[PDB]
Every structure is written in structure tokens, then in C-alpha cells.
Amino acid sequence: KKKLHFMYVAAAAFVLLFFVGCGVLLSKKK
């Protein structure tokens, strides 16, 4: 469970780079 608290939050910070790359995809949808 502790892994979901710290080891996880640390992920949401890095993995964010993959979620931000989709931003352009949405703005492209027309």
C-alpha cells in the first residue's frame, strides 16, 4: 500500500511526460 503513496506519486510526475504528449493530439482533432 505504501508503494501506492510514495512510489506511485513519484510516477505520476514522470509518467506525465506521456500524458502531455497527447495534448497535441486533442488540439489536432477536428
Swiss-Prot record:
Transmembrane segments: 6-26
Cross-link (Glycyl lysine isopeptide (Lys-Gly) (interchain with G-Cter in ubiquitin)): K29
Stretches the record annotates as Interaction with PSEN1: 4-30
Highest taxon, organism lineage: Eukaryota
Protein name: Notch 1 extracellular truncation
Lineage of source species: Eukaryota, Metazoa, Chordata, Craniata, Vertebrata
Gene name of the encoded protein: NOTCH1
